[PDB]
Amino acid sequence: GANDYVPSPITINTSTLPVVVIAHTYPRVIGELTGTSNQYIFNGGSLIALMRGKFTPTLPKIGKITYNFRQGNNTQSSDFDIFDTGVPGLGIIIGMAGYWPATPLVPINSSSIYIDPVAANTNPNAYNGATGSFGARLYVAFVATGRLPNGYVTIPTKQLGHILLESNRASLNNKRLTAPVMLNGGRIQVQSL
Ligand SMILES: C[C@@H]1O[C@H](O)[C@@H](O)[C@H](O)[C@@H]1O
Ligand SMILES: [Cl-]
Ligand SMILES: [Cl-]
Ligand SMILES: [Cl-]
Ligand SMILES: [Cl-]
Ligand SMILES: [Cl-]
Ligand SMILES: [Cl-]
């Protein structure tokens, strides 16, 4: 059908965090995961649409930290909300972007934000150019929020939040399609020298 768009998750992997080699300074970023992308977070309708994605984080917000991702193309630091993994001492920060690399990494630092097009954060009538899918890039860094013991620690799989699909086509907008944004759990290692 014209509006038969379907959601798919976008996921990033804890297992790509390098060994954390250690400072008693909190908060601090202790490494970046490998960024991921999904071109087809929303896909399937037969009629092209102007679309945008609104991201809402749903983990507890501990506080803020200034950071500049080594990945992405931002040249200055921004404020990021630190979200709780649930594991003591460990939080994460999030950036998201449109699928295509020219679009900017958008720091997640408010209760909800448009990740693409970023213009929609100040223009409520702005959408992506018409096409048959909506995708995104996902970036995550781990944050030490307190003292970390030496050795391995397990991070559970966490749902970081969801993307809501919006459109200027009412029938599509009204479906309120949502896609999960996931942190795949895994093992990290701390080496305290
Ligand atoms: C062609 C489509 O362009 C859109 O802007 C993107 O959101 C989709 O991922 C897809 O690449
Ligand atoms: Cl994915
Ligand atoms: Cl990966
Ligand atoms: Cl893809
Ligand atoms: Cl950044
Ligand atoms: Cl969760
Ligand atoms: Cl309409």
Distance between CA atoms of 90 and 108, rounded to whole angstroms? 17
**Tokens, residue 71:** 């990945």
Q: Is 128 in the pocket of ligand 1 (CB under 6 A)?
A: yes
Could you identify the atom of ligand 1 that is nearest to the CA of residue 98?
A: 7
Among 118, 133, 137, 138, residue to substitute to test ligand 1 (most atoms within 8 Å of Cβ): 133
Residue 19 exposure: Cα atoms within 13 Å on the Cβ side: 8
**Tokens, residue 63:** 């506080």
- The owner of tokens 């300074």 is 25
Buried b (16+ CB within 10 A) or exposed e, 149-160: eeeebebeebeb
Write the CA distances from 120 to 10, 31, 69, 115, 123, integer angstroms: 21, 30, 23, 9, 5
For residues 106 and 96, the answer to whether their CB atoms sit within 8 Å is yes
Domain ranges for the chain, please list them: 1-193
For residues 20 and 189, the answer to whether their CB atoms sit within 8 Å is yes
Structure's resolution in angstroms: 1.5
Q: Is 83 in the pocket of ligand 1 (CB under 6 A)?
A: no
Q: Is 53 in the pocket of ligand 1 (CB under 6 A)?
A: no
